[PDB]
Amino acid sequence: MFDKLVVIDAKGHLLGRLASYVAKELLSGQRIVVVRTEAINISGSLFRNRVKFSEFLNKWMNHNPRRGVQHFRAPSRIFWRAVRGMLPHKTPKGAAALERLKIFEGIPTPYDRVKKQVVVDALKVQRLRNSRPVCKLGDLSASVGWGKQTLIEKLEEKRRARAKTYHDKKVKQADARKKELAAPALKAIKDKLAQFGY
Amino acid sequence: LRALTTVWAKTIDNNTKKRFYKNWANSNKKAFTHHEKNFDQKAQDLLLKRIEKYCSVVRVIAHTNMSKLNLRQKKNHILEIQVNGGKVAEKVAFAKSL
Amino acid sequence: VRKAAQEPKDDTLQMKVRQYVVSAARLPIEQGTKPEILQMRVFARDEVHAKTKFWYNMRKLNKIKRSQGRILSVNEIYEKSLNTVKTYGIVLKYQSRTAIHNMYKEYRDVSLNGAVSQLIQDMAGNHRAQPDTIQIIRTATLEPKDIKRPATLAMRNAALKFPIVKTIHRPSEKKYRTVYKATRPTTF
Amino acid sequence: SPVAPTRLWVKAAFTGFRRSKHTQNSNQALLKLQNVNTKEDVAFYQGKRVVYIYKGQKKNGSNYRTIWGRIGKAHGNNGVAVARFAHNLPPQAIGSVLRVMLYPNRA
Amino acid sequence: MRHLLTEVNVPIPDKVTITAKQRVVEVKGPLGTIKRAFRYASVDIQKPTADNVKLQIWQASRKERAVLQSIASQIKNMIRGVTEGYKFKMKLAFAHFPIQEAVAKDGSSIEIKHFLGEKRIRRIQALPGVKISRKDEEKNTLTLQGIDLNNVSQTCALIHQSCLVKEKDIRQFLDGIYVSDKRLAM
Amino acid sequence: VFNKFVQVGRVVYINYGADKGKLAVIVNIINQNRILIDGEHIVRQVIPIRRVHLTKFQIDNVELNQRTVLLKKKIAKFDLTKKYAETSFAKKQAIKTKRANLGDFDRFRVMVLKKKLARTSAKSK
RNA sequence: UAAGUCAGAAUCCAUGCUGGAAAGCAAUGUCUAAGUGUGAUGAUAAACGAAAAAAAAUAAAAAUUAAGUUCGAAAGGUAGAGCGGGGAAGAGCGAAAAAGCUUGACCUUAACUGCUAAUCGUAAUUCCAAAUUAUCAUCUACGUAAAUCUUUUGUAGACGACUU
RNA sequence: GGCUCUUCCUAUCAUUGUGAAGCAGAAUUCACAACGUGUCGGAUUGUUCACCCGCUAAUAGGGAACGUGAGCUGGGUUUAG
RNA sequence: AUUUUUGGUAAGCAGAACUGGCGAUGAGGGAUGAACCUAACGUUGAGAUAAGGCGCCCAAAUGCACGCUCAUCAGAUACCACAAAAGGUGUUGGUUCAUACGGACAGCAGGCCUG
RNA sequence: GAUCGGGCAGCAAUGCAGAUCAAAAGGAAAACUUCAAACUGGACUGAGGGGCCUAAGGGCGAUUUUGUCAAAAUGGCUUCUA
Ligand SMILES: [Mg+2]
Ligand SMILES: [Mg+2]
Ligand SMILES: [Mg+2]
Ligand SMILES: [Mg+2]
Ligand SMILES: [Mg+2]
Ligand SMILES: [Mg+2]
Ligand SMILES: [Mg+2]
Ligand SMILES: [Mg+2]
Ligand SMILES: [Mg+2]
Ligand SMILES: [Mg+2]
Ligand SMILES: [Mg+2]
Ligand SMILES: [Mg+2]
Ligand SMILES: [Mg+2]
Ligand SMILES: [Mg+2]
Ligand SMILES: [Mg+2]
Ligand SMILES: [Mg+2]
Ligand SMILES: [Mg+2]
Ligand SMILES: [Mg+2]
After folding, report:
1. Distance (Å, rounded) from C-alpha C76 to C-alpha C56?
2. Long-range interactions of A158-166: CB distance < 8 A, separation 24+
């Protein structure tokens, strides 16, 4: 909660839980960024959650639809509404809380590099019996016509490929430095530290 | 979608320049000057190659020449006309030919 | 919070039932007499509770009421060896919204108190029984020839193996608790 | 110069005051000390002095200002502790980091 | 309650080879190779020995238990499928209007015309691995052959169904293309 | 695959207990959530299998419901002690225990020793 | 049908269409006189390592139960030293919100050496960084592009607005 | 009460896709997903209703202060002749 | 209002009995709200509670252990905002009668029996 | 010594190993309840301004030391914020 900016990778995370956590963190001052929202999970038939999101599409301000609720169809915003729900968002304090959260789908530029984090309690594998039903957000936003799923996939692949580069370089050199750590001069100091309670 | 870039020719006739101005004749008519004096064909080709590299859609920026008609308005019209054809590269080639 | 000695170190793991013997006699209390003593085995969480259980059953079974008698004594019974697993049979009557029922139940546990505690939790969850309603007719530590239930007989074999298929992450102390960590756990 | 050399204070967060749904005691702030997790560990700070620093216009040549207090007691079973200050903390303070200092060492 | 262990044993006979990786089953025999993806069940598919394939499910509930025997049987079908294939015969049934048929050379598509005298054209494309055939001696029949049970049975289905009669008593009309013979070994 | 099972006579790590960080053996499986536990450093306990972690040490000598004593013997003959002691797990664990006991000077040392390991590697020759 | 699969509606979602002051974003034309102008005072729901880039899989594996990790971390000085750190130009690469990565004139710094620390008197933020930007005052430049009103059009119009 | 206009309900009149029949066809009846779209012109009556003449895929039943008087109308109802 | 009550198909209807209460009364809890639950009020600090809670809005357990539950209309609790007669080879318990290597159930077989 | 079984053996007849109950003779220990003795860290508070009093020990209800403070500093006012 004290790290300057937490960045969460929403993949395989359960909506409501990741929600509450990020909410609290937000209230208490942690500035968060959540990513890969399209990858969040919800417990239930994709059908059932489409029924539900439909049921929501159905609510509106009667005389003037263009006043009040906007029904947002991107995973980012689905999550966002989710969190705003768990804060006192009409309160100036609640406002601040909100301003702290930023959300995206896929993993956009500034965030390639920074280390993505996970909320352990929020994981589908951790939370849900394996044989019970679930959806990925982006599937819902598909049924509700958010068009970018395909694009995001392509984009993600692109970035995955940059990863293999980073990693591989990082491995090669980081083996070479571990090998030369076993050479005589340093082998000495190694031993000194081991004894020192490595 | 988003605009990646616009490649202008050397030749942009006064009336089209009119688009950028409310009155042409009380203006020093400074538009596109820098595009002219600094014009480097190499760079243009570079931009087109760019578009080939990164782009989904290609459109031509098009010019309604009002001087051919007898109407009051002489100030031309500036349109995007998208180009539909199989391969991005060929789209670009075509656009260039134009 | 008063523990009976035979309960586990962690209070969590078992209910606060203990097994009591209560015995009393018709109040007139004639001295040199050889009194009829009424004795019964009750499961309760208290001495008080046990007394209640006692009297309820006693006034149902016989003429006696409390103003009509005296409590001689209340003695907790303990289980012999907490080193072995035993199969217990229990015979119940409980009260469901429609009517009253006689059930026979079996549990594999280390204590008859454990057998009972498990019995209660089960009876709540599966049958929506109310503790107060439950009446345990008779209880027997079961000889293998006598064990009738499939989920009981299910566990007799030495070849028993459970893989642990899913490990839900549970830090050792609170001191280690973090909401969000820099890498994903594993199951196995 | 890049930073301050040594900072001997633990980071605390200001959660809010001690409250019930409709009622709040603003005498007792609640803090969460960094890497402090259970009541046991919080206890360790029992007497400790804690500061609230904030900035502002020049007052006696210093552009900062302060409110001093002490953590008194464990609040609830994760790491949370009541603090009392000299002046009950202003409420916007809630979003912010307070300095737990180790000054109270006694025999 | 929850069941501890449940197993099912799949025999593997002459000329069959089987592959289990991360729930993905492959079966290669004389007639070809079939693969299926079981990622949807929590089941354990044990490394096959040229003799057998063992399937296990742990800590299961009544609903879960059924998935075992069903995945198993599907495997049975993959195997038997690559040993002796699957052939179906569909009798082509009409009262007055003769059902006219044109099947391609791939054996991959069927055209049905003149159904109940309708002027419409029926188009049915057979699933992958499925071949459709009609001979001079077939006496108004179709024959669908393939390795994979599903693709073949399903192709038969799509055919039978394309011709369902509508808006009249179905018990008098009965025109249609129905499966006469199912699960033939070639 | 499934190589490591919970069996009569398994070697298990007690985590999340009063007994955390201690090895034990399993004499009986009580229901599906609880096993019966023993060892030299631990009383005879019943524990939810949840609190325990399987160690990949199976002692086939152990017998169903074995008395505390005989078990302790079999355990000793098996060298749970030596064997576990070599484990990456216990090695790391001990290393931790080491880091635990260090004073201001110890840290400082480790830091200068840490800087040296960095700045000195150019000593080829 | 329980897992798993096909078909399948005037339905739903899209496609097409009209809005679009969403206190959203992009590409492009020209201009922003004079300086990588300075001074003082200020504000920013949160600076004192507020440190940290594999990808995927949780019924996987030959084998590793926790970021319960790893890296950094010496005096908020001076004089030397110089492991090491940061980078002009130009030339490379880089686009999901181009954030930056390479090379590189050069700029700089740790061990070690000498001075300097004490009288900030047994505590009272350890007021210094980084990214932004307000106000007042001033030095240089007294220019450049464009718009609007007073005209014009009637493809528009209650008036503003709009086409020209 | 009508006129005008908008929206909602579904206990669906019609239109779409179906299941059922004492379903041969045609017509009809029972049921399901379902309002998405449509549901009219005149006699007499102040009429709501009712009854008739007609066209129609059909001429469904309802709600919204028994929708709707600073929107009309004023025939009815309820001052004073 | 609890309990008891009469007329009434019934009513947030109309009448009666005992004790309260609301009116004349705030505080915490039932989100909300006269008569419910705790509890009765001078100004103020500490501590420990009742009623009720402790995933987030929200103080406090994403505590530790049990049983049961998958809803293409889940469920989420006093006064409270309603559901019945009637049905289900969904799943789990229990009750009473039955079969089984002197080989059952079922299927395939074969001539009630038999592999 | 006696029973038992969710063992290894053994083709069977039988043995090895268990677990439960347990004779006389010995050992060595845990949990619970009650009642006692004592250590160390915190928070809030200091009402009153005596020489009187005694169970001969004390009681009668905080003292000591040190630092800072001249500047709008502290307290307040107007306005605003949470
Ligand atoms: Mg029909
Ligand atoms: Mg018909
Ligand atoms: Mg489909
Ligand atoms: Mg609809
Ligand atoms: Mg209906
Ligand atoms: Mg009917
Ligand atoms: Mg008319
Ligand atoms: Mg009206
Ligand atoms: Mg009159
Ligand atoms: Mg009563
Ligand atoms: Mg009344
Ligand atoms: Mg009463
Ligand atoms: Mg009362
Ligand atoms: Mg009155
Ligand atoms: Mg009251
Ligand atoms: Mg208080
Ligand atoms: Mg939980
Ligand atoms: Mg002031």
Report:
1. 19
2. A159/A106, A159/A107, A159/A112, A162/A112
Within 8 A by CB and 6+ apart from F96, the residues are none
Distances (CA, A) of F8 to C156, E143, F19, F25, F63: 11, 58, 20, 8, 7
* Cα angle E62-E63-E69, degrees, rounded to a multiple of 5: 90
CA angle F51/F56/F59 to nearest 5° reads 100
Q: What is the Cα–Cα distance from F80 to E113, expressed in whole angstroms?
A: 79
Separation CA A109–CA D48 (nearest Å): 44
Q: CB–CB of D82/D18 below 8 Å?
A: yes
| H/E element, B41 | helix B41-54
Consecutive H or E run containing B42? helix B41-54
d(CA A198, CA A179): 18
DSSP E48-96: PBTTEEEEEEEEE-HHHHHHHHHHHHHHHHHHHHHHS-EEEEEEEE-SS
Cα distance from N-terminal residue to C-terminal residue, chain B? 24
**Determination approach:** X-ray
Helix F104-119 with A184-195: angle, nearest 10 deg: 170
The dihedral of CA A80, A85, A88, A92: what is its sign?
positive
CA distances in angstroms from A117 to A5, A42, A97, C107, D61, listed in the order given: 10, 20, 20, 45, 43
Shortest-distance nucleotide from E171 CA to C1': H23
Per DSSP, A106 falls in state: S
Burial string for F87-116 (b: 16+ CB within 10 Å, else e) reads eeebeeeeeeeeeeeeeeeeeeebeeeeeb
Per-residue tokens: B9: 């020719």
> How distant is the alpha carbon of residue D71 from its chain centre?
7
User: Which helix or strand (DSSP H or E) is residue A15 part of?
Assistant: helix A15-27
Chain E CB within 8 Å of residue F2 CB: yes
Where helices occur in chain E by DSSP H, the ranges are 62-83, 149-162, 170-173
Gap positions in chain F, given as the residue before each gap (C–N > 2.5 A)?
Answer: none
Q: Are strands F34-39 and F42-48 parallel, antiparallel or unpaired?
A: antiparallel
Coil/strand/helix, residue C125: helix
Amino acid letter, residue F99: R
Count of alpha carbons within 13 Å of F86, Cβ hemisphere only?
4
**Chain F contact set for A193 (CB, 8 A):** 110, 113-114, 117
Residue in C137, C132, C139 with CA at minimum distance from that of residue C52: C132
Q: Is D78 on the interface with C (CB under 8 A)?
A: yes
Other beta carbons within 10 Å of C145: 5
Q: How far apart are CA A120 and CA A18, in angstroms?
A: 9
Query: Any idea what DSSP says for residue A13?
Result: B
Resolution for this PDB entry, in angstroms:
3.5
Nearest CA in chain A to E62: A131
Interatomic CA distance for residues A107 and E143, integer angstroms: 53
Nearest CA among D16, D5, D13 for reference residue D98: D13
Alpha-carbon torsion, ordered E75, E77, E78, E84, to 10 deg: 140
Are D95 and A29 inside 8 Å of each other by CB? yes
- In this complex, is the C-beta atom of D13 within 8 Å of any C-beta atom belonging to chain A? yes
The residue among E3, E78, E7, E81 whose CA lies nearest residue E38 is E78
Residues 58-97 of chain D: which lie with beta carbon within 7 Å of strand I? 72-73, 75-78, 80, 82
Q: Give the angle E25-E28-E32 at the CA atoms, nearest 5°.
A: 125
Residues F23 and F19: their CA atoms lie apart, in Å, by: 9
Spatial neighbors of A130 by CB under 8 A, at least 6 apart, are C166, E42
